[PDB]
Write a protein that binds this ligand. Structure first.
Ligand code: ABV
Ligand code: CL
Ligand code: CL
Ligand code: CL
Length: 163
């Protein structure tokens, strides 16, 4: 584990992370996709061998020795708010199991279901709180990645609030 497990936020391309593994915001079919998933496919294309997995699950595939954790958040266009919320919480619980099994000291993680799967709603708080519920009992350094300058400030504020 990390000597003093922390949460941090960075506003940059997750394909440039400085962590021991990466979480992909994957689709269920292991397709190249858009956004985070596209960047992950360009950086670690070998990790898409048999990466398909159901909604609310995570499947790890190694790119050399670098672990890519394919986490499938719900598309809120298709799920009810209630069922979507349950699957989004579950995807993060599966990421915490994988991070623990791999024995990494750090992980790069995006906010699941906040982009093209958001059903056009702002889900920063909902997604980040499910990330915390899952990751709080792990001892990896967690580095949350975002693109938007206002999201960076709100994520930073939420981390600092609980410290
Ligand atoms: N290349 C990309 N990295 C990230 C990280 C966080 C959010 C969106 C994107 S798109
Ligand atoms: Cl960047
Ligand atoms: Cl998304
Ligand atoms: Cl963002």
């Amino acid at each position: 584990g990390a000597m003093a497990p922390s949460y941090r936020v960075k506003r940059m391309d997750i394909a440039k992370n400085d962590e021991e593994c990466v979480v992909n915001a994957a689709n269920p079919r292991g397709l190249p996709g858009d956004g985070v998933c596209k960047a992950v496919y360009k950086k670690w294309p070998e990790s898409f061998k048999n990466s398909a997995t159901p909604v609310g699950t995570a499947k790890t595939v190694m790119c050399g020795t670098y672990p890519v954790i394919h986490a499938v958040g719900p598309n809120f266009s298709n799920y009810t708010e209630s069922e979507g919320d349950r699957e989004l919480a579950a995807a993060y619980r599966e990421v915490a199991k994988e991070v623990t099994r791999l024995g990494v000291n750090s992980v790069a993680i995006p906010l699941l279901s906040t982009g093209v799967y958001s059903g056009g709603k702002d889900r920063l708080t909902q997604s980040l709180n499910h990330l915390f519920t899952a990751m709080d009992s792990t001892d990896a350094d967690v580095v949350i990645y975002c693109r938007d300058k206002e999201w960076e400030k709100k994520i930073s504020e939420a981390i600092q609030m609980r410290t």
